[PDB]
């Protein structure tokens, strides 16, 4: 825990120049158009523009710790707004261009953005979610569950049980939730395109799942300001702010980024909404 490997921290940022960035976001659009099964992989980089620091960025939690400084929050977890990137991912699932969403983030923003939980794997847990030890019934709360490391929160199960409710926040020693990891692995294996957004891919097995897409000829796109463990295996690397990338991508796809109405929980995905017809590519 104290000694836990926190990985490569504070690597230099890379910025694709505008012309190279415009061309690569068009190539990503082309790949999304050509792909039957698109899986997105998200980490802490997608929440930095909402005031939540990442782990391994220049001002990341672990980076700052290494230099004896503190991470800085410009929001509480409760007052944090889903980013343009969060809301882009809601719309991409709604129009049938996103098959599955695998996230290492505990910030609860995917769930609160209105993203359907049956298409989301929260590999590291969710600050807002507590789970009954006895019946496994999960509860999505409007405030952070006040503990971490899978401890008793103090509340009891209300299913018509009184079981001990525990937080879902994995400590260093904890196995990933079997249900989320199995569905994430199946989604990544079956994918013909895996897009990583604001993750350095340094944590096993989370960071390895996008590689699973590469088996059987699938494509891998990595979007990130810093290098990532698997840059080598990427068909496409985009070095820019994930919000700039996703807003340009949505524009190329003819999709609007929907308004956020405040925190809303959607359990199950609907049939896809209408989407624009596809360009002639080849
Ligand atoms: N706006 C942005 N646009 C693009 N990239 C960004 C942006 N902001 C940050 N980044 C990049 O986003 C990347 C985020 O990388 P890391 O900080 O390792 O976070 P993880 O989600 O992969 O951490 C994995 C687990 O490790 C922890 O212990 C927890 O358990 C985590 O769940 C960096 O390379 C930034 O350059
Ligand atoms: C574990 O929750 C957290 N998520 C993120 N992203 N940053 C944190 N800094 C302290 N705790 C944090
Ligand atoms: Cl500081
Ligand atoms: Cl908070
Ligand atoms: Zn229960």
From Swiss-Prot:
Site (Formation of an covalent adduct with nitro-fatty acid activators): 9
Entry keyword annotation includes DNA-binding: yes
Catalytic-site annotation from UniProt: 124 (proton acceptor)
Identification of the protein by name: NAD-dependent protein deacylase sirtuin-6
Record: residues binding Zn(2+): 132, 135, 157, 161
Localization (cell): Nucleus; Chromosome; Chromosome, Telomere; Endoplasmic reticulum
Domain Deacetylase sirtuin-type as annotated: residue spans: 18-256
GO terms, molecular function: chromatin binding; chromatin DNA binding; damaged DNA binding; DNA binding; DNA damage sensor activity; enzyme regulator activity; histone deacetylase activity, NAD-dependent; histone deacetylase regulator activity
Keyword Lyase: no
Cofactor binding remark: Binds 1 zinc ion per subunit.
Family: Belongs to the sirtuin family. Class IV subfamily.
Shown segment, full-protein numbering: 13 to 298 of 355
Effect of residue 278 to A: Does not affect ability to promote DNA repair
EC number of this enzyme: 2.3.1.-, 2.3.1.286, 2.4.2.-
Keyword list, A-Z: Acetylation, Acyltransferase, Chromatin regulator, Chromosome, Developmental protein, DNA damage, DNA repair, DNA-binding, Endoplasmic reticulum, Glycosyltransferase, Isopeptide bond, Metal-binding, NAD, Nucleotidyltransferase, Nucleus, Phosphoprotein, RNA-binding, Telomere, Transferase, Tumor suppressor, Ubl conjugation, Zinc
Effect of residue 4 to W: Increased protein-lysine demyristoylase activity
GO biological process: base-excision repair; cardiac muscle cell differentiation; chromatin remodeling; circadian regulation of gene expression; determination of adult lifespan; DNA repair-dependent chromatin remodeling; double-strand break repair; glucose homeostasis
Gene responsible for this protein: SIRT6
The species this protein was found in: Homo sapiens
Record field: compositional bias (Pro residues): 271-280
Modified residues (N6-acetyllysine): 24
Residues reported in the UniProt entry to bind NAD(+): 44, 48, 55-56, 62, 104, 124, 198, 200, 224, 226, 242
Residues annotated with Phosphothreonine modification: 278
Regulation: Compared to the defatty-acylase activity, the protein deacetylase activity is weak in vitro, and requires activation. The histone deacetylase activity is strongly activated upon binding to nucleosomes and chromatin in vivo. Two molecules of SIRT6 associate with the acidic patch of one nucleosome, while the C-terminal disordered region of SIRT6 associates with nucleosomal DNA, leading to efficient histone deacetylation. The protein-lysine deacetylase activity is also activated by long-chain free fatty-acids.
Changes after translation: Acetylated at Lys-24. Deacetylation at Lys-24 by SIRT1 promotes homomultimerization and binding to double-strand breaks (DSBs) sites.
General function of this protein: NAD-dependent protein deacetylase, deacylase and mono-ADP-ribosyltransferase that plays an essential role in DNA damage repair, telomere maintenance, metabolic homeostasis, inflammation, tumorigenesis and aging. Displays protein-lysine deacetylase or defatty-acylase (demyristoylase and depalmitoylase) activity, depending on the context. Acts as a key histone deacetylase by catalyzing deacetylation of histone H3 at 'Lys-9', 'Lys-18' and 'Lys-56' (H3K9ac, H3K18ac and H3K56ac, respectively), suppressing target gene expression of several transcription factors, including NF-kappa-B.
């Amino acid at each position: 825990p104290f000694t836990a490997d926190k990985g490569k921290c504070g690597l230099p940022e890379i910025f694709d120049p505008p012309e190279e960035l415009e061309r690569k976001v068009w190539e990503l659009a082309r790949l999304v158009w050509q792909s039957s099964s698109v899986v997105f992989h998200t980490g802490a980089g997608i929440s930095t523009a909402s005031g939540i620091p990442d782990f391994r960025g220049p001002h990341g939690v672990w980076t700052m710790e290494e230099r004896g400084l503190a991470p800085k929050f410009d929001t509480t977890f409760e007052s944090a707004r889903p980013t343009q990137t969060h809301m882009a991912l809601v719309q991409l699932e709604r129009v049938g261009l996103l098959r599955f969403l695998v996230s290492q983030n505990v910030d609860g923003l995917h769930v609160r953005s209105g993203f359907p939980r049956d298409k989301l794997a929260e590999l590291h847990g969710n600050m807002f979610v507590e789970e009954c030890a006895k019946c496994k019934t999960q509860y999505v709360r409007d405030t952070v569950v006040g503990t971490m490391g899978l401890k008793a929160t103090g509340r009891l199960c209300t299913v018509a049980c009184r079981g001990e409710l525990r937080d879902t926040i994995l400590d260093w020693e904890d196995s990933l939730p079997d249900r989320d990891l199995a569905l994430a692995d199946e989604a990544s294996r079956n994918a013909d395109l895996s897009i990583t957004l604001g993750t350095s891919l340094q944590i096993r097995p989370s960071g390895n799942l996008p590689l699973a897409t590469k088996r059987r000829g699938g494509r891998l796109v990595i979007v990130n300001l810093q290098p990532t463990k698997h840059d080598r295996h990427a068909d496409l690397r985009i070095h820019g702010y994930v919000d700039e990338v996703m807003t340009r991508l949505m524009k190329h796809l003819g999709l609007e980024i929907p308004a956020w109405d405040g925190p809303r929980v959607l359990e199950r995905a609907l049939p896809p909404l209408p989407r624009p017809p596809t360009p002639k590519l080849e």
